[PDB]
Design a protein around this ligand. Structure first.
Ligand SMILES: C[C@H](CCC(=O)NCC(=O)O)[C@H]1CC[C@H]2[C@@H]3[C@H](O)C[C@@H]4C[C@H](O)CC[C@]4(C)[C@H]3CC[C@]12C
Ligand SMILES: C[C@H](CCC(=O)NCC(=O)O)[C@H]1CC[C@H]2[C@@H]3[C@H](O)C[C@@H]4C[C@H](O)CC[C@]4(C)[C@H]3CC[C@]12C
Ligand code: NA
Ligand code: NA
Lengths: 310, 309
């Protein structure tokens, strides 16, 4: 069965690491961190890896139940919640995953809305929702152990023991004390435990090559900044590769970024078997390309193929 | 050949609001005309209504706040221009009901408005706040290129700055909230006729009813368990658009199969305009395992008799 990519333009793609549209292609060759994100991870033959799951609505979302308000030396109001699988079934910590699928894969203050619909009931249940922040770098962020902490501006109107949803929206802050680093993984089981079942790190092997990302800009609750989240493949590629399950015939698929109005190839890239792109580019920053362009699968090559410079 | 995605019920999301699919659902005694505008795609891949491909675009808006507006209603009110989701200006002369992704139902839609300033340690200022868009209000005029949203926040929204609306749920479904998932907004404002709509859908065969993909939608407060029903999940919209497969008749026979056992749980008609019917004589959820999925069987005609559900 032949390998294919979806025919979707940049303006028809979404980020696999946060619920955002793709804004631009992007490179950063001087990146010093190890790139090992856990969402948006899928091999070219369709094996999901890390915490990757198929629902766009599951990315950085949580489902569970608040157990109690908790004391914390930090300002604000703090709540403990158990976390289940996204479909509501209990999370099995013995499963071969780093954490419940969809768990955020980066260090930061993730901003969103906690909402609740009571189980007890004109026989209709009570509801509430409030802005909330989850600090994924905190020792209380232990989703692989089945529970996390979130905090609210609201000081009273969160109910214990009731079904709870976290809808992610953006970041609370990216200032110098906000610990935002998109390439630093959370410790899914806490500070004395090793992360397990991780999707592997990704890097260019060929000299002169760098990773190519699908970049989205992420909203902020306040403060200064222009934070972005870079994913290795958009969520629609994850979904396509999973459905097609096409055998990888070499370690590298050659792909070309095509302008369909004119038929010209703007650049070529290596699509690696583990699910990421490299290009021969010596510049950092966005790629200037029309959003009607798209990646086209051209051939299976090997790791020694020399890319045309970008 | 025509194909549907091999995605289980637990791998599908709603095309009318950013929610996972929770259950399949029927309501044969539904009195309203079903004419939703998101999640509309023919089997040969033509998007219709306000439907677009991005899961993040459903009930989302992009634009710029022009000013605070004075209004006798409680809260603080803001006018924003709306662009296409990709940032290009919305062309009101285009043959669409409204900007693609515009909500397709009457209610108080609850979400977060966020802004990142254009002017800049050479970094721009930001703010975000909870907000509500009342799609039934006379100030909801997305076909005219602008809408109003309201906030609890009384002052910290900036004029002239890029603005995003991220949908989250509903503010209320109480008796004064105008929530009705089958009542369209009046996209050009109050007392105006909608244009370029995706057509209404209905069962024509006796004994048949529509089959919906239902999601339960969060509430900011109050009592209720509101739900949003879509005709096809967003992943089907995306798949049909990619494939552009010729419809060999007006009706595809599909089977909902349990792959653990192999057995068909029920069959349904998948109509060319992008909706499902089943032969069922009861209202309510379909109690079925979420590991099942719809499989294309064959093209039939409008006179094919479905096995009862
Ligand atoms: C508890 C964590 C930090 C834990 C840590 O290890 N440091 C902090 C980091 C960011 C904090 C939040 C943000 O500063 C935003 C907000 C600020 C309000 O003053 C209090 C609530 C609220 C929502 C804060 C609650 C506490 C949070 C979530
Ligand atoms: C302006 C519209 C009413 C539209 C109409 O013409 N009637 C109303 C309907 C629901 C209202 C909102 C909801 O009641 C929730 C909330 C209530 C706060 O007291 C004020 C802000 C806030 C967010 C309200 C602002 C004004 C809204 C959005
Ligand atoms: Na993760
Ligand atoms: Na609409």
């Amino acid at each position: 069965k032949p390998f294919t990519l979806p025919i979707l333009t940049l303006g028809e793609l979404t980020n696999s690491r946060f619920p955002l549209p793709i804004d631009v292609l992007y490179t950063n060759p001087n990146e010093s961190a190890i790139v090992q994100c856990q969402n948006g991870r899928c091999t070219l033959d369709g094996e999901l890896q890390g915490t990757t799951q198929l629902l766009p609505t599951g990315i950085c979302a949580f489902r569970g139940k608040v157990t109690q308000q908790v004391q914390d030396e930090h300002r604000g109001t703090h709540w403990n919640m158990t976390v289940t699988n996204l479909n509501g079934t209990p999370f099995d910590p013995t499963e071969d995953v780093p954490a419940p699928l969809g768990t955020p894969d980066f260090s930061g203050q993730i901003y969103g809305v906690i909402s609740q619909r009571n189980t007890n009931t004109g026989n209709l249940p009570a509801n509430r929702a409030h802005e909330a922040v989850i600090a994924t770098y905190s020792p209380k962020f232990t989703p692989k152990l089945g529970n996390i902490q979130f905090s609210t501006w609201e000081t009273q109107d969160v109910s214990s023991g009731q079904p709870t949803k976290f809808t992610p929206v953006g970041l609370a802050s990216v200032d110098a004390n906000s610990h935002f680093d998109q390439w630093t993984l959370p410790s899914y089981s806490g500070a004395l435990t090793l992360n397990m079942n991780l999707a592997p790190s990704v890097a260019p092997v060929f000299p002169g090559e760098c990773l190519l990302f699908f970049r989205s800009f992420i909203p902020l609750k306040g403060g200064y900044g222009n934070p972005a989240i870079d994913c290795l493949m958009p969520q629609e590629w994850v979904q396509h590769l999973y459905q097609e399950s096409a055998p990888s015939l070499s370690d590298v698929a050659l792909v070309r970024y095509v302008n369909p109005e004119t038929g010209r190839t703007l650049f070529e890239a290596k699509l690696h078997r583990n699910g990421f792109l490299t290009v021969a580019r010596n510049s950092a920053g966005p790629v200037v390309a029309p959003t009607n362009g798209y990646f086209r699968f051209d051939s299976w090559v090997n790791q020694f193929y020399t890319l045309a410079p970008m």
